[PDB]
Design a protein around this nucleic acid. Structure first.
Lengths: 187, 103, 151, 135, 138, 57, 51, 71
RNA sequence: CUUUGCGUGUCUAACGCAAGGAAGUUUGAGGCAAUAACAGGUCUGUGAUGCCCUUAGAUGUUCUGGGCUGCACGCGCGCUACACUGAUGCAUCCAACGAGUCCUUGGCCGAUAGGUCUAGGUAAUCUUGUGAGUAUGCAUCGUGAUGGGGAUAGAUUAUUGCAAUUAUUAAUCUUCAACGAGGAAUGCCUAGUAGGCGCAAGUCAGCACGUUGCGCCGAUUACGUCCCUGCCCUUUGUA
């Protein structure tokens, strides 16, 4: 069985692309995004959590909004309902396809060969690309609704659908290409 | 004589001082074979003071964490008061406050 | 996809604890008007319900819902009084520039509603025993409308 | 429909609810404006851009003489007037002139408190080494 | 009569779930599980019902008595105490082979274990436990 | 565009601050590359440049 | 007449028995001990610090 | 920026306007319209009771979120 | 016991990973703390003290009153903020550390503070199961410096004290500023931890925006490194 909010089934659906596979934790699965459990003793317990839990967990910011997971459960429960409303299929399959495309491919590290702070082209790991994906999803949605009288759930639902899409309107998909602008040049 | 009920309080700072008394006075009762219940160990009232270590303000503001501990323990009996005076009066301990009470 | 799950048996509707507590107050507030008995204060224009609160309540039936809530709360904890009911409707006062603290509820309004229940005789002393309690007629007033609201 | 308004020689705005619109009048605030709205029998659901001639006429009467409609005295701004010696409600540009009287009273009397208004320092006894600096 | 009683522990919460033979009613203090706000976590309490099934629990009843902790910690105590009850209900009366099924399907899904994370004490020269205040320099 | 490659073994850890990490990959062939985040053996990752081999160390 | 105000309350009322000093007066459990005085004699009273 | 009353020109349109749209929220009324969010709540509460539209979920006290009825 | 399995090592000392287990970083967190010192700080913690000062027209002592709070302006620790994951009004129901010869239930009066008449408590017994607040549910508000923000200011009612003015606080009504995420610099921190949210104790007649403990809600990101800032041990150079 196992369904999120009881209205969705973990069973069925699929990972979008090779890589970022097995790093993601689907398959089995827990109704309700939330789980208080030990995930930070080893350094790859972080990709045992299902990514809906990692969304609600990292959705609390900044100092003022931290904690209150029960609050972040609600606004994600509304967000998955809205995703369903447009281009209806599976909120999870749209969300999994979003965090596939969300994070950056390559990155600029500072290796100078002694003396200088000089940039150099380095590809990103599969774990960090999932870490950066869910971070960049939220920081678009939070900044989008920070001053506007638009509910955060609306921003999150909108941000996720956009990320799956190639519109580039999103903050996340821009900040992918903003890094890949400089990462091309640092080759 | 008459059917009475006695419940004797014990208090001290040390654990080791009372564990003499709890073992001794129950065996002192079992000379005469009175209706003993075992020693009821109450929760420990830990007293606490935290002062600064330094006399003046200088250096990092470091602190002591001083503690006392107090151990209320209760030997239960059902026996008249003339019988118990032999048991308590012999085997008094150094620095252990003890008070016998009917009911 | 509809919502899953039940309990094994269909839940018994008899006592007041089986009723959801907010939905109880929605019914019994309306019962106080349509019956008529309970009677109004003079001061209703003023108040706000607490020293801590900085504004008066919006809903004009704030007294009936409070008298509805306090009467069921006697069933939850039998023994309680006025300083008890000051704690249960406590709240975060905002001190100003300073950090926040707790504060106790209003003593006039919480005492008065109990005296109106004493006049009918649903909640009563207890003159020697410290704290108010609901009587026999108090329970049957509650438990008859517990079955009605779920129906 | 009426955009913009004026009650008691002070400009009340439209596009605001009737309770909060009345706080734009000087010497009125949030808790008393509810008692004005409740005892004038105005619906709080209505908007301050409307306000018929019956509604404003009641508010001016209550604002002038709130002792008539059983407001029990602790709600009033200048409670015990210290001139005629009664429970008094000061509204609008009366409150400007009353503040001009009460400060210039204390300058003639020559209190310490009056000299703080004269120099324009902090009055209430606050540590002005560091705070209230810029001026 | 058939009786077992069991406890769970999240943090400083504790929840003694007595259970007996009966009709099929699961109750906290004297509510239904249908209440238990926050409501969002209401689904969380029903977790051992969904995994094991309805038709096991209808032979028994459970009555839980809870204190300590907070809002969320009280749910996790009840979560454990219901799951620990029906596992421990076998040992006394019902066949001992079916314990290995009903326990290990829940373990395949810390419902009996209880995670011992407790609050580390504060130390001097700082606001939090490990956090410190601020160094000034010049 | 991007073409996938499987990790044989972590080689060391590279750079001044030690954050970037050096890996032998195998296409899906072998060459040495640098990678950012947490990586272990039995792992697969995308590369835009199939060429461009990192210095041995 | 002279040599006495009302001396009932506040730090001027009371002093350290051991050293006659008002400042840093530990009055928990009725010690009446100035802190410089209290810390060095704390083991002899009963107080033993741990954790 | 926004208009506070019903605007009884647009009330005749507002029967037609909102059941067209796929999303029905607080925001989508003042998207189509240029009025404060508050009217939108009493609009979609009116369109529950009188008119067509239906809840996506039974309810919530913060984010409403209706669909078009499709009938 | 790092027990068992497989790797890693002159397979010696011991590491890594997986399974099992309440727990496998020495299981987590503290107390205790060497030899050398530094012209560190404290004669204002002391009946710990040498020397000097002054000793009745006093630097002893003590009484009335003021001052340490005085403001063109710099610097350091904190608190509340800028909102809609929100503010406000109603309802729902959950903690642990204390602490009292003062802590306060119960009943009447009062919008409030608070008062008044009884009443339990030398305390696992009474206050107290301290019905704590972030939280949850249902309403109104609508992006406006607005109901976010509560400084600044007038007027009134109680409380502690022998005395409240430079206002000790707590209330009730008003008064409605700056501030739209903070320039250069730079602090703290690796799991029940950060951060947020309260509570209790210490000083206390009265006063916490402070410190010391206590729980509750509970994340993100490392599991490496010697680039910056310091540290320890070798070889090396020194005027």
């Amino acid at each position: 069985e196992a369904k999120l909010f009881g209205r969705w089934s973990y069973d069925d659906v699929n990972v979008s692309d090779l890589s970022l596979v097995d790093y993601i934790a689907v398959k089995a699965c827990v109704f309700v995004p939330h789980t208080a459990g030990r995930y930070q003793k080893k350094r790859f317990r972080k990709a045992m959590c299902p990514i809906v839990e990692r969304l609600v967990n990292s959705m609390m910011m900044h100092g003022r909004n931290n904690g209150k997971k029960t609050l972040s459960v609600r606004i994600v429960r509304h967000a998955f309902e809205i995703i369903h409303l447009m281009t209806d299929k599976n909120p999870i399959q749209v969300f999994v396809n979003a965090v596939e495309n969300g994070g950056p491919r390559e990155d600029s590290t500072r290796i100078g060969s002694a003396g200088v702070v000089r940039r150099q082209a380095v590809d990103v790991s599969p774990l960090r690309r999932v870490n950066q994906a869910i971070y960049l999803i939220c920081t678009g949605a939070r900044l989008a609704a920070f001053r506007n009288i638009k509910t955060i759930a609306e921003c999150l639902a909108d941000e996720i659908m956009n990320c799956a899409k190639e519109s580039s309107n999103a903050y996340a998909i821009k900040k992918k290409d903003e890094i890949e602008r400089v990462a091309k040049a640092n080759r | 004589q008459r059917l009475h009920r006695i419940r004797i309080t014990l208090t001290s700072k040390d654990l080791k001082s009372i564990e003499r008394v709890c073992t001794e006075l129950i065996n002192g009762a079992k000379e005469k074979n009175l209706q003993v219940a075992g020693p009821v160990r109450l929760p420990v009232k830990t007293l606490r003071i935290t002062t600064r270590k330094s006399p003046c303000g200088e250096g990092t503001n470091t602190w002591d964490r001083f503690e006392l501990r107090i151990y209320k323990r209760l030997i239960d009996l059902h026996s008249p008061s003339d019988v118990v005076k032999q048991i308590t009066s012999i085997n008094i301990d150094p620095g252990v406050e003890v008070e016998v009470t009917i009911i | 996809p509809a919502y899953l799950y039940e309990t094994p048996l269909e839940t018994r509707v008899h006592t007041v604890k089986d009723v959801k507590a907010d939905a109880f107050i929605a019914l019994y507030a309306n019962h106080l008007k349509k019956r008529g008995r309970f009677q109004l204060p003079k001061w209703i224009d003023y108040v706000k319900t607490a020293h801590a609160k900085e504004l008066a309540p919006y809903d004009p039936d704030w007294l009936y819902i409070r008298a509805a809530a306090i009467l069921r709360h006697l069933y939850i904890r039998p023994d309680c009084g006025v300083g008890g009911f000051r704690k249960v409707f406590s709240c975060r006062q905002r001190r100003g520039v300073r950090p926040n603290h707790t504060s106790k509820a209003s003593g006039k309004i919480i005492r008065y509603i109990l005296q109106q229940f004493e006049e009918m005789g649903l909640v009563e002393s207890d003159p020697e025993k410290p704290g108010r309690r609901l009587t026999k007629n108090g329970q049957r007033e509650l438990d008859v409308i517990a079955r009605q609201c779920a129906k | 429909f009426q955009h913009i308004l004026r009650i008691l020689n002070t400009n009340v705005d439209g596009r605001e609810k009737v309770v909060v619109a009345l706080t734009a009048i000087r010497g009125i605030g949030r808790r008393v404006s509810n008692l004005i709205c409740k005892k004038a029998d105005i619906d709080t659901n209505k908007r301050a851009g409307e306000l018929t001639a019956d509604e404003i006429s009641k508010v001016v009467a209550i604002a002038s003489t709130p002792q008539q409609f059983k407001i029990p005295t602790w709600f009033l701004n200048r409670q015990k007037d210290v001139k005629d010696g009664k429970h008094k409600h000061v509204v609008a540009n009366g409150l400007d002139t009353v503040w001009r009287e009460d400060l210039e009273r204390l300058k003639k009397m020559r209190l310490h408190r009056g000299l703080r208004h004269y120099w324009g320092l902090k009055v209430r006894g606050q540590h002005t080494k560091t705070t209230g600096r810029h001026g | 009569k058939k009786r077992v009683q069991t406890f769970g522990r999240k943090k400083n919460a504790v929840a003694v779930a007595l259970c007996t033979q009966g009709k099929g009613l699961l109750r906290v203090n004297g509510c239904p599980l249908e209440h238990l706000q926050p409501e969002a976590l209401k689904v969380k309490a029903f977790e051992p019902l969904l995994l094991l099934g309805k038709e096991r629990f209808q032979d028994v009843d459970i009555r839980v008595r809870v204190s300590g902790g907070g809002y969320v910690a009280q749910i996790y105590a009840i979560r454990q105490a219901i799951a620990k009850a029906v596992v421990a209900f076998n040992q006394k009366y019902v066949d001992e082979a079916t314990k290995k099924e009903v326990r290990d399907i829940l373990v395949a899904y810390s419902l009996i274990v209880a995670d011992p994370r407790r609050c580390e004490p504060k130390k001097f020269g700082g606001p939090g436990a490990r956090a410190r205040y601020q160094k000034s320099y010049r | 565009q991007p073409k996938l490659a499987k990790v044989e073994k972590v080689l060391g850890r590279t750079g001044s601050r030690g954050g970037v990490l050096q890996v032998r990959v195998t296409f899906m062939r072998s060459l040495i590359r640098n990678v950012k985040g947490p990586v272990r053996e039995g792992d697969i990752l995308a590369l835009l440049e199939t060429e461009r081999e990192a210095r041995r160390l | 007449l002279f040599n006495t105000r009302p001396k009932k309350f506040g730090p001027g009322s009371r002093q350290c028995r051991v050293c006659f000093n008002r400042h840093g007066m530990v009055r928990k459990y009725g010690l009446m001990m100035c802190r410089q005085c209290f810390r060095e004699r704390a083991n002899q009273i009963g107080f033993v610090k741990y954790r | 920026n926004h208009s506070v009353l019903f605007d009884k020109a647009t009330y005749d349109k507002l029967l037609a306007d909102i059941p067209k749209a796929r999303l029905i929220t607080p925001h989508t009324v003042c998207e189509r319209l240029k009025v404060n969010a508050s009217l939108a709540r009493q609009a979609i509460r009116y369109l529950k009771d009188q008119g067509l539209i239906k809840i996506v979920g039974e309810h919530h006290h913060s984010q409403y979120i209706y669909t078009r009825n499709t009938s």
